[PDB]
Design a protein around this ligand. Structure first.
Ligand SMILES: COc1ccc(C(F)(F)F)cc1CC(=O)N1CCS[C@@H](C(N)=O)C1
Ligand SMILES: [Zn+2]
Length: 140
């Protein structure tokens, strides 16, 4: 689990969105595994606006933050899970790192701010849904 809290937005994995998220929906995209809902309180996260390929992510199944090198956002074939059939996921970045299904939502960050959230995994790989192209997260 986990979310990004920027401005009056909450960014979560679409497959983990709650009823309150769907009832206060701003934007969702199943091909990216992302959903954004509106919040009453202002958040403290800032979004990175860069081309970094190195950063750090939070892994809840280890209680640890790990430094990683990650690929540029791309269209990647992801195997079937409990939440999606095997399909192509867009704007996904891959790295070598530990992940388990409940690690989705952990933040990936670089020197400029939040880059994305854990969305996929398996066999020593972790995939992150990028948010750096969503420029509207920075404005009301
Ligand atoms: C954090 O992800 C995992 C991590 C490890 C493994 C394992 F291979 F060990 F079974 C499997 C996963 C699950 C997975 O890839 N999912 C979770 C459901 S939503 C799906 C997607 N965004 O298409 C991504
Ligand atoms: Zn950066």
């Amino acid at each position: 689990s986990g979310a990004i809290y920027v401005g009056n937005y909450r960014v979560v994995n679409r497959h983990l969105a709650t009823h309150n998220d769907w009832a206060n929906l701003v934007w969702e995209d199943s091909s990216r595994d992302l959903l954004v809902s509106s919040t009453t309180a202002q958040g403290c996260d800032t979004i990175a606006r860069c081309d970094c390929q190195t950063g750090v992510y939070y892994c809840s199944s280890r209680r640890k933050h790990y430094p990683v090198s990650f690929s540029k956002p791309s269209l990647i074939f992801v195997e079937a899970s409990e939440y999606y059939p095997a399909r192509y996921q867009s704007h996904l970045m891959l790295a070598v790192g530990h992940s388990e299904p409940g690690d989705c939502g952990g933040i990936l960050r670089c020197q400029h701010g939040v880059v994305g959230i854990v969305s996929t995994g398996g066999n020593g790989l972790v995939g992150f849904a990028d948010v750096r192209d969503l420029l509207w997260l920075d404005e009301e």
